[PDB]
Amino acid sequence: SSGLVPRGSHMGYSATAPVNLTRPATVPSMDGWTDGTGAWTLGEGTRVVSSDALAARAQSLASELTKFTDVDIKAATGSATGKDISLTLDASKKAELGDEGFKLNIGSKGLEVIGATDIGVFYGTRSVSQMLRQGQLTLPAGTVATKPKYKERGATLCACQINISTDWIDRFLSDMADLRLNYVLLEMKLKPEEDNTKKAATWSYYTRDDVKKFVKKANNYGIDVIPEINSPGHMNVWLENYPEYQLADNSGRKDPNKLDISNPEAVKFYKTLIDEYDGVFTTKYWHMGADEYMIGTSFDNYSKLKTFAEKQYGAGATPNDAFTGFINDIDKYVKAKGKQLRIWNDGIVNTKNVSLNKDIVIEYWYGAGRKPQELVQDGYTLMNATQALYWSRSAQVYKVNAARLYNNNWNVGTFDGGRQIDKNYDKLTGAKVSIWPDSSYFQTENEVEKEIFDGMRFISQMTWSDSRPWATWNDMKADIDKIGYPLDIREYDYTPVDAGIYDIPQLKSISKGPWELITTPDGYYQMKDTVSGKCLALFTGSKHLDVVTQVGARPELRNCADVSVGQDQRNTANERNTQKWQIRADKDGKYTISPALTQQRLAIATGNEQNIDLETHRPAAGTVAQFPADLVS
């Protein structure tokens, strides 16, 4: 027989290690590792030791490692031994480590993590978690210091029109943290509550309490959550119930997507929303969008804006000057609140009388004038938001291809359309992937999470390390799958109840049941009515992005769709995904039932829920309907 037996090395340091023992990979890579003698092993008695000030980080790392490794790892203060992981914050190391970088020293004093800031220490703990959660508890000795090349590294998460659930957002922030990504542009509606804005409280929205909760989670992970309220285009979710602020074309036809920037009360409405957001986000930035104001049309059909431009910005001014003026006026407004403005690059165009303020960050997604190289010449600050890094649920042109970008030598100076700029440009802030819903029934948010996995590791690698230490994409892919997700995602209880047959009293207005529940690959349920043999769907009501957003919409029974197939089955997507339900357990133990695509919650309608949609249609009192969770708690 082979005599095969676990090696079982003692915990702590050993001067003996084989020379080519694997060093578990990380993402981002930690480039320039200097090898040392021996190796260190996490084992019984290993602790996470730190100062009092680092106690919370030490405790959180010890609990996490206890879960991944099955060894009881406790946090402690005072002296570290060779059996231990030590956390040190040394702010004098700014030159070597900067604001986010860290150094690991693995040797006879144990596994030392050093950062110059709290977030730098927390980012080194992410590499310690990644290295120890891959089935190997012995790490080769040596040392490495690493810091990100670019200051802003992350994603656009567009939680606009449709709702991305807060549980999804919380997983996404844990994943960003794991990959050292520090930037999320969250385009989203914070529920407007004032008399003058409250008729825009249509769904999707997020409550102030929920925003404060995920902003606090983000900030503990070193993530800047930047709100966007896109303007003066893509304003349907805000202007639908405010036609007084909508821009009319020369024939008098109003577009709920366009703010009338010539109407000072419409501009004041936008600023009022900025002041509403100010109390729940902590960032120093405001993103006002500014893409695609005249998509589907042209300024020639809005002569009122040329008249306005001439009055406001002098004879010869054009609608593009009025458009840029509006952005500069919002820049003035947010700067007075201590923020810096950011916009998308596309509407920045050809001005005469007005020039765009240089203190506005330009997030460049669309090779549309200027070219990147022109904007560099003018000294603008630029973030690379190339369409090569887009995903959309419906627009199959936008699916990140990480293999292609890794193998074709894309880097953060490769702007949209392969327009290369110097990747060392001193005002290149970094780069981001962008996650857009578009027609939103083709993919559930859980399928979006499965799909973006590789592209999120790709952007993390190229914005921190800017290197390709894996010979090909497929070599990186093998390591990122071994590294896996961070603990919070592995612990999320996607399907808290077993498949089986259930009584569900909340559904009696639809059927007396009982109901057969089965689970789907993406973490939801189909609910079949054993009386009719049909399945519960949330299928009908007013929609945005082809998803029912109507507050008070009622579910219905429809012929059972096949919920076991993947997102490539696009021809049956809508029947299939309108039949998926997310069940969640309360703190503690009551269950709520949500349509997977809408992320509202089923409830029995009382007639006392207050919402602009309900001013004009209410479900019959006592029937089961969906409502935002805040109207039904």
Ligand X SMILES: CC(=O)N[C@@H]1[C@@H](O[C@@H]2O[C@H](CO)[C@H](O)[C@H](O)[C@H]2O)[C@H](O)[C@@H](CO)O[C@H]1O
Chain center to CA of 481: 20
Q: Which stretch binds ligand X (CB under 6 A): 105-113, 414-422, 434-442, 481-489?
A: 434-442
Complex with ligand X: residue 240 or 292, whichever CB lies closer = 292
Q: Is 293 in the site for ligand X (CB under 6 A)?
A: no
Residue among 105, 262, 392, 444 that touches ligand X (CB under 6 A) = 392
Tell me which residue has its CB nearest to ligand X: 234
- 230 in a labelled binding site: yes
- Considering only residues 171 to 190 of the shown chain, the ones binding ligand X according to CB under 6 A are 187
Q: Is 203 in the site for ligand X (CB under 6 A)?
A: no
Q: Which residues have C-beta within 8 Å of that of residue 56, sequence separation ≥ 6?
A: none
226-255 footprint of ligand X as x/- string (CB under 6 A): ----x---x---------------------
> Which of 18-40 are b and which e, b meaning 16 or more Cβ less than 10 Å from the residue's Cβ?
eeeeebbbbbbbbeebeebebbb
**Cα separation of 562 and 569, whole Å?**
10
Secondary structure string (H, E, C) spanning 380-396: CCEEECCHHHEEECCCC
Place of tokens 């930047």: 226
What does the DSSP 8-state code read for residue 89?
E
Q: Are strands 500-502 and 428-436 parallel, antiparallel or unpaired?
A: unpaired
CB of 433 to ligand X, least distance (A): 12
CB of 449 to ligand X, least distance (A): 17
Q: Is 161 in the site for ligand X (CB under 6 A)?
A: yes
Q: Is 28 in the site for ligand X (CB under 6 A)?
A: no
**Cα separation of 498 and 396, whole Å?**
34
Q: Which stretch binds ligand X (CB under 6 A): 262-270, 433-441, 518-526, 604-612?
A: 433-441
E strands, 189-314, in order? 224-231, 246-248, 254-259, 285-289
Amino acid at 119: I
**Beta sheet of 47-49, edge-to-edge order:** 12-14, 34-41, 138-146, 102-107, 110-115, 85-89, 47-49, 74-76
Residue among 100, 321, 438, 522 that touches ligand X (CB under 6 A) = 438
Residue among 54, 106, 141, 158 that touches ligand X (CB under 6 A) = 158
Complex with ligand X: residue 204 or 463, whichever CB lies closer = 204
Q: Is 390 in the site for ligand X (CB under 6 A)?
A: yes
- The two three-digit tokens of residue 118, written as one number: 């709290």
Place of tokens 């978690």: 129
What does the DSSP 8-state code read for residue 222?
T
CA atoms within 13 A on the CB side of 599: 20
Q: Is 292 in the site for ligand X (CB under 6 A)?
A: yes
Q: Which stretch binds ligand X (CB under 6 A): 157-165, 328-336, 415-423, 565-573?
A: 157-165
Q: Is 608 exposed, middle or buried (0-12, 13-18, 19+ CB in 10 A)?
A: exposed
Complex with ligand X: residue 249 or 292, whichever CB lies closer = 292
CB of 161 to ligand X, least distance (A): 6
Do residues 110 and 83 touch, judged by C-beta distance below 8 A? Answer: yes
**Cα separation of 383 and 389, whole Å?**
13
- 292 in a labelled binding site: yes
The residue from 292, 310, 451, 556 that is catalytic is 292
Complex with ligand X: residue 438 or 516, whichever CB lies closer = 438
Complex with ligand X: residue 438 or 529, whichever CB lies closer = 438
CB of 414 to ligand X, least distance (A): 17
CB of 394 to ligand X, least distance (A): 8
Complex with ligand X: residue 86 or 567, whichever CB lies closer = 567
- 205 in a labelled binding site: no
**Cα separation of 287 and 463, whole Å?**
21
Q: Is 365 in the site for ligand X (CB under 6 A)?
A: yes
Q: Binding-site residue total for ligand X (CB under 6 A)? A: 17
Q: Which stretch binds ligand X (CB under 6 A): 31-39, 44-52, 126-134, 431-439?
A: 431-439
- Considering only residues 82 to 111 of the shown chain, the ones binding ligand X according to CB under 6 A are none
Q: Is 344 in the site for ligand X (CB under 6 A)?
A: yes
Q: Is 160 in the site for ligand X (CB under 6 A)?
A: yes
556 is catalytic: no
- Considering only residues 393 to 412 of the shown chain, the ones binding ligand X according to CB under 6 A are 395, 398
| 169: nearest Cα among 201, 227, 211 | 211
- The two three-digit tokens of residue 83, written as one number: 């059996």
E strands, 353-469, in order? 361-364, 382-384, 390-392, 414-415, 419-420, 428-436
Residue among 118, 291, 451, 488 that touches ligand X (CB under 6 A) = 291
Q: Which stretch binds ligand X (CB under 6 A): 154-162, 373-381, 494-502, 608-616?
A: 154-162
- The two three-digit tokens of residue 109, written as one number: 């004093």
CB of 302 to ligand X, least distance (A): 19
Complex with ligand X: residue 100 or 449, whichever CB lies closer = 449
Q: Which stretch binds ligand X (CB under 6 A): 155-163, 201-209, 241-249, 413-421?
A: 155-163
- 409 in a labelled binding site: no
CB of 379 to ligand X, least distance (A): 23
CB of 389 to ligand X, least distance (A): 11
Long-range Cβ contacts of 370-376 (<8 Å, 24+ apart): 370/345, 371/419, 372/415, 372/416, 372/419, 372/421, 373/419, 373/421, 375/345, 376/421, 376/422, 376/425
**Cα separation of 165 and 600, whole Å?**
9
**Residues taking part in catalysis:** 292
**Binding residue numbers:** 161, 187, 230, 291-292, 390, 438
Binding site for ligand X (CB under 6 A): 158, 160-161, 187, 230, 234, 291-292, 344, 365, 390, 392, 395, 398, 436-438
